[PDB]
Amino acid sequence: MDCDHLLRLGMTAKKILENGKGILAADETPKTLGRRFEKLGITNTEENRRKFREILFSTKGIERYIGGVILNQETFEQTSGSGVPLTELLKKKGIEIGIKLDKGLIDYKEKEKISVGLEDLDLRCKSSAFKDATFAKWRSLFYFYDGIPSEDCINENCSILAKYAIICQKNGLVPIVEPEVFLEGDYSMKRSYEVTRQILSTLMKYLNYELVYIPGVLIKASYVTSGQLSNEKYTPKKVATFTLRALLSTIPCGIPGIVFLSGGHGSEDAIGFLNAINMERGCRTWSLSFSFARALTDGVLETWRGDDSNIEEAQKILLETSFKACRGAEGKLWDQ
Amino acid sequence: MDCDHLLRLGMTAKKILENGKGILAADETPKTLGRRFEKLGITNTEENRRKFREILFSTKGIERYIGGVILNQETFEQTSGSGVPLTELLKKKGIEIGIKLDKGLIDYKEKEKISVGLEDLDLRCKSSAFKDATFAKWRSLFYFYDGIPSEDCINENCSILAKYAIICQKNGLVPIVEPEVFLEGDYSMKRSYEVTRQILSTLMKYLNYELVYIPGVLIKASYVTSGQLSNEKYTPKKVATFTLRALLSTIPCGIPGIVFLSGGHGSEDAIGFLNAINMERGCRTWSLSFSFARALTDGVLETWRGDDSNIEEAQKILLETSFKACRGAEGKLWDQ
Ligand SMILES: [Cl-]
Ligand SMILES: [Cl-]
C-alpha cells in the first residue's frame, strides 16, 4: 500500500468506467445460473454454463460499452469451443477481468443474512487462477420486513464488506462492495430511501475505520424504489431524484463511481433509471454507471435458448442492450 | 421541511462561503473571552466584551472577506457606543448572523467530554433574541490519550451533533457542526489522520440517520496535525495532503462546505494550512474555507489592549488578516 500501489487501484477503478462504460456482471454461481436456465428450458450442464459465458465474452464490439466483466470462479478455468481461455477473449478486447469472491450468505439473527468467506480471502486473492483479475466483487443482501434491516445486520454486513475491501486492496485488486437492498419485500419508497441512507453512510464508516483507499473502491448499489410487494408506484424521475439524493447525502467525493445493480427490475427499467439519474442536476465527482447481470443477459438467454443457431441473434441483443446502458450512463438515451 | 424550506437552507450555506468568504467566529462565552482578556491585561467587564464585539463588527470593508459571523448569545442583547444593536452593524453590511447554541461540555466516561443543551434547543431556536440569525454553531471536543477518543465518545458526540443539526434545520437555521479534535495532546499525525476519518465518517452516519438535509449543513473541522505535546514536526503541504485525504474519504458530495477552525494553531499557520489545502488537486464539490476565532481576532486583542486609541489599528489588523484568510480560501495567498 505505497503511493504507486494506491494510484494503480485508482487508475483501474477509472478505466472500468471510462467513456460511459459499465460492468457486465457474469458471476452467477452454477446454482444461481442453473435456476435461470431451468426457467427457459436449458439444461444446467457445465458445458451450457461455459458456452453461455463464451457467447457473452465473444460478442463483437462489446468493449465499446463494457469496461469490465465480473467472472465466477469456475469461468477462470474454462475455454472457448475454439480452445482459447475465456479470460483471453476479454483480455484481447482490453476489458478488465473481475472475480466474485464472496461465498454466499448465511443466516443472521431472525430473517436476515450476512455474507461469508473472509477467513481464506487473502489466500484466494493470491490464487494463480485469478492472476489476470484486476478487480473483485462481494455481495451482501439486506432483507426488509417490519423492524428490518436491523442495526446489528447493517453493522455486521458493512464490517464484512470493509474487511473484504481492505484485503482486496492489499492484494492489488479494486473491490466492488455490493450492499444490495432486496427488491422482494413489502416496503414503501420512503422506507427504502431512509434505510439506503443508513446503509450507505454506515458502509462509508466501516470503509474508513478499515482505512480503505477510497479512490480505489467501487460501490454497487440498489436503486431506491418501493418493494415489489408494495402497492406503491414510482417513475424513473422519482427513482432518479430519491437515489441521487441518497447518494449525495452519503458518498464521499473520493469514491470514483457508483455502479447500479439491476436487482429484479426489468432491463428496460434498470436502463431507464440509469438514464434518468444521469440527467439529474446536482454536483458530484463520481460516475453513475452500471454493473448489470440480468438487465444485460436475460435477453441473451431468452434469445439463445440453448440452441447454437440462436447465438448470433443473442449476441446482437447483448450489444444493443449494452449500447443502451452506456448511453444511459451518460444521460443520452433519448439522443441521436 | 418542504422543498422551499430546504432550498433556503442550501442558499444560506452557499451565501456564507461565496467568493472565497469565510466565517468570523466571535461566540466566546464571557468565561472563555475573559481568560483571553486577562492574559493581555484587559478587565473582563461586560463593557469590554461589548466593545470588543463592536470593534470587530464595525470594521470597515470586512464584508468583502467575511460571509457570516458567529455570535455569543449575550451579544444579541448588546448595542454599539452610538446606540445601534450590534446585530444591525452586521445586517447593514449584508453579513449572515449566526448563534452558538451549545451549553458547553460535561464529563463523559474517563477523561472525555460530551456537549450539552439539546433539551431546550428547539425552544431556544425560536427565541425572539435570535430572530435575525440564519445559522448556528454547536461544538463537541475530542480529547486524545492512549485509547481515546473511545468509540462510545465518538458515537455519542456525533449523535448529539446530528440531533442539534436536525432541530436547527426544522427551525430554518443552517447548522454548523463542530467536531473539534483537541490540539493539546500527545498524538502522532498518523493517529490524528486515522481518528479524523473515524469521527467524520461517524458524524456523516448520524447526520444520515437523523435525515438531516445534507446540502444545508456546514462542517467546522480541525486540521489534521500531530498533537502539541508530540515531538513530531509537519509542514503546510503535509497538513494539506492529510487533511484533504481525510475529507475526500469521508465527506459526501452534498455537503456545501468545510470551514476550518484555528484550534490553538497560530493565525499564520491556520491561514497557511488553508491556502495549502486549496492548492491541492483532487476533485471535490465542497468549498474549503474558514471559521476562525483566534486566527482572526488574537491580533485585534493584542493591538487593542483595552485602549480606545488602539482601535483603528486593531480594525486594520482584522481587515488585513481577513483578507489573507479569504485569499487562502481560494488558494491565492502567494498571488498578486
Ligand atoms: Cl451468484
Ligand atoms: Cl466559548
What DSSP string describes A252-294?
Answer: BTT--EEEE--TTS-HHHHHHHHHHHHH-----SSEEEEEESH
Rounded to the nearest angstrom, the gap between the alpha carbon of residue B41 and the centroid of all alpha carbons in its chain is 26
d(CA A319, CA B50): 72
| Vertex A23: Cα angle to A21 and A27 (nearest 5) | 165
Return phi, psi of residue B222, to 5°.
-80, 145
Number of H helices, E strands in chain B: 11, 10
Q: Tell whether B191 is within 8 A of chain A (Cβ).
A: no
Say which experimental method was used.
X-ray
Closest ligand (CA of B30)? 2
Residue B212 is part of a domain; what is its CATH number? 3.20.20.70
d(CA A305, CA A300): 8
Return phi, psi of residue A10, to 5°.
-60, -40
Contact B228, B263 (CB under 8 A): no
**Resolution value in angstroms:** 2.0
* Ion ligand 2, residues whose Cβ is below 5 A away: B 28-29, 32
Measured CA to CA in angstroms, residue B63 lies from B22, B91, B94, B287 at distances of 10, 10, 7, 18
Grid coordinates in use for A110?
431472525
Question: Is A178 a known active-site residue?
Answer: yes
- The amino acid at residue A270 is A
| Residues of chain B with C-beta less than 8 angstroms from the C-beta of A256 | none
Question: Which residue does chain A place closest to B282, by CA atoms?
Answer: A254
For residue B185, the 8-state DSSP code is S
- How many CA atoms are closer than 13 Å to the CA of A326, on its beta-carbon side? 23
Return phi, psi of residue B116, to 5°.
-130, 160
For residue B148, the 8-state DSSP code is B
Question: Which residue does chain B place closest to A286, by CA atoms?
Answer: B253
- Please answer yes or no on whether A205 and B204 come within 8 Å at the CB atom: yes
Q: Tell whether A201 is within 8 A of chain B (Cβ).
A: yes
Find the B26 Cα to ligand 2 centroid distance in Å.
Answer: 9
With CA atoms as reference, report the closest residue to A169 among A291, A12, A292, A22. Answer: A12
Task: Report the number of distinct structural domains present in chain B.
Answer: 1
Number of H helices, E strands in chain A: 11, 10
Range of the domain at B38: 1-336
Q: For residue B149, is the peptide bond before it cis, meaning its omega torsion is within 30 degrees of 0? A: yes
Grid coordinates in use for A105?
450468505
Return phi, psi of residue B143, to 5°.
-75, 150
Question: Is B220 a known active-site residue?
Answer: yes
Contact B177, B135 (CB under 8 A): no
With CA atoms as reference, report the closest residue to B304 among B296, B315, B295. Answer: B315
Q: Burial level of A165, CB count in 10 A (0-12/13-18/19+)?
A: buried
Report the SS3 class of residue A214: helix
Contact B271, B333 (CB under 8 A): yes
Contact A193, A155 (CB under 8 A): no
d(CA B203, CA B161): 8
Measured CA to CA in angstroms, residue A158 lies from A172, A237, B249 at distances of 21, 29, 16
Which uninterrupted H or E stretch holds B322?
A: helix B311-329
Q: Which of B198, B207, B285 sits opposite A208 (nearest CB)?
A: B198
For residue B288, the 8-state DSSP code is E
Find the A150 Cα to ligand 1 centroid distance in Å.
Answer: 24
- Print burial letters for B93-114: b (CB count within 10 Å at least 16), e (below 16): bebbbbbbbbbeeeebeeebbb
- Print burial letters for B270-303: b (CB count within 10 Å at least 16), e (below 16): bbbbbbbbbbbeeebbbbbbbbbbbbbbbbbbeb
Find the A26 Cα to ligand 1 centroid distance in Å.
Answer: 9
With CA atoms as reference, report the closest residue to A262 among A201, A174, A322. Answer: A322
